[PDB]
Amino acid sequence: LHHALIPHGKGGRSSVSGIVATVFGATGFLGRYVVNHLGRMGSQVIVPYRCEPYDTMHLRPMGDLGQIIFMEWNGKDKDSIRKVVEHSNVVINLVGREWETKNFDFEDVFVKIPHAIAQVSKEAGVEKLIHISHLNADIKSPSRYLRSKAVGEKEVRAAFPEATIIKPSDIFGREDRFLNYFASMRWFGGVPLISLGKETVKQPVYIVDVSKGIINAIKDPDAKGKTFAFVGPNRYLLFDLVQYIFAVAYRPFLPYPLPHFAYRWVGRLFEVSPFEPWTTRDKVERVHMSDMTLPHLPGLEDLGIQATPLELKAIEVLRRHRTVKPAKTVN
């Protein structure tokens, strides 16, 4: 087990956990939680970044002295991937984008980059690879996002046959794009939902649950070639979910049914802007689409985690959106 990678200490900041993890996409929303959980137990984290060092500054205090190493990379180059994963025994893939840029479409982000990462990691001798896809990923999905994810799973499995695939369902949290997107609709007055938000059912999952699940999948010896589905405890109709979100935020709720075609047109207008879009054609289709049910897939409970309901963390997420009657669930 390479003596330098033998765990030591009491699992704290200056302990040694025996884990050398390269975390692609660590500067995002789930990346900060994954890096924090890795660093608080004494692992060494290699953080490949393509942005400005200033935007990665917040990850520095997450580890002891020398336990977090920042490295430049870009997804179009295999040599940067190679130099970033040479010495790791764990590779975690978190690269994703909810919109298409002029330089990267869904094909580059969810297919080509994951395939390159998996191939380079397999050539480099990395023991464990953990790839993130979507719960609703399938090759026949209406949205290109999900279709790309399905393709990505196929290529990651082909390049790294022992990779662990994790399929979360609409992660919610303090820096999420779920609760904040639904609560950011106050500016536009009445909320617009296709068919009044009464036809789609969501199963959101807490961010800390997903991060701890990734950590425990690293720890678990037999979770090599398995595929997990990380879902929350409760399923909600979208209408009552948004009603609960607005009630927690103390904001007035005025939901009006909107035509699907009309909604798509609205989404398209947002996309043209250079800056990140509040909504996109793919986004409105993704939030209108119902969450899949995969009972045969091992879940978060199979990793020794009890999923935390949205009712406990909704206040934490939505308190900043201000200036009791939890929603009804369907199971």
Q: For binding to another protein (CB under 8 A), which residues are involved?
A: 1-16, 20, 32-33, 36-37, 40-41, 44, 46, 58, 61-62, 64-67, 69, 71-72, 83, 86-89, 174, 208, 211, 221, 312-313, 315-316, 319
Between CA 213 and CA 286 the distance in angstroms is 24
Q: Give me 53's structure tokens.
A: 């060092």
Q: Pick from 152, 199, 311, 313: which is nearest to 244 by CA?
A: 311
Residue 129 is labelled as binding a ligand: no
Per CB under 6 A, the segment of 164-172, 221-229, 251-259, 296-304 that binds ligand NDP is: 164-172
Query: Which one of residues 23, 59, 90, 132 is an interface residue with ligand NDP (CB under 6 A)?
Result: 132
Closest distance of CB 76 from another protein, Å: 18
Based on the shown chain and the rule CB under 6 A, indicate whether residue 272 belongs to the binding site for ligand NDP. Answer: no
Q: 17 with 7: CB under 8 angstroms?
A: yes
Q: Are 67 and 12 a contacting pair, CB within 8 Å?
A: no
The annotation status of 173 as a binding-site residue, yes or no, is no
- Please report whether residue 95 would count as binding ligand NDP according to CB under 6 A: yes
Q: Does 28 bind ligand NDP (CB under 6 A)?
A: yes
* Two structure tokens written together for 172: 């919610």
Distances (CA, A) of 265 to 3, 184, 206, 271, 292: 59, 19, 31, 10, 26
- Give yes or no for residue 18 binding ligand NDP (CB under 6 A): no
Query: Could you tell which of ligand NDP, another protein, none binds residue 307, using a CB distance below 5 to 8 A set by kind?
Result: none
Using CB under 6 A, which residues numbered 186 to 225 contact ligand NDP? none
CA 4 to chain centre: 31
Residue 30 among known ligand-binding residues: yes
Tell me the closest approach of the beta carbon of residue 132 to another protein, in angstroms. 18
For residue 108, give the nearest of 138, 151, 168 by alpha carbon.
151
**Cβ 93 to ligand NDP, closest distance in Å?**
7
Please identify, using beta-carbon distances, which residue of 146 and 305 lies nearer to another protein.
Answer: 305
Q: Does residue 126 have a known ligand-binding role? A: no
Q: Is 97 in the site for ligand NDP (CB under 6 A)?
A: yes
By a kind-dependent CB cut-off of 5 to 8 A, residue 17 interacts, out of ligand NDP, another protein, none, with none
Shortest distance in whole angstroms from residue 162 CB to another protein: 17
DSSP for 237-264, written as a single string: EHHHHHHHHHHHTT-----EEE-HHHHH
HSE-CB at 232 with a 13 A cutoff on CA atoms is: 26
In this structure, are strands 171-172 and 128-132 parallel, antiparallel, or unpaired?
A: unpaired
Please give the Cα distance from 305 to 297 (Å, whole number).
Answer: 15
Q: Are 45 and 68 in contact (CB under 8 A)?
A: yes
By DSSP bridging, strand 192-194 and strand 256-258 are parallel
Q: Pick the binder of ligand NDP from 31, 192, 197, 213 (CB under 6 A).
A: 31
Asked whether residue 31 is marked as a ligand-binding residue, the answer is no
CA distances from 234 to 88, 231, 241 (A): 37, 9, 11
Q: Is 82 annotated as a binding residue?
A: no
Q: Confirm or deny that 27 is annotated as ligand binding.
A: yes
Among the listed residues 40, 50, 198, 251, the single contact to ligand NDP using CB under 6 A: 50
The 8-class DSSP code of residue 192 comes to E
Tell me which of another protein, ligand NDP, none is bound by residue 28, counting a contact when its beta carbon lies within the kind-specific cut-off of 5 to 8 angstroms: ligand NDP
- Picked from ligand NDP, another protein, none, the partner binding residue 16 (CB below 5 to 8 A depending on kind) is another protein
- Binding-site members are 25, 27, 29-30, 50, 95-97, 145, 149
Residues making contact with ligand NDP (CB under 6 A): 25, 27-31, 50-51, 75, 94-97, 104, 109, 132, 134, 168, 170-171, 178
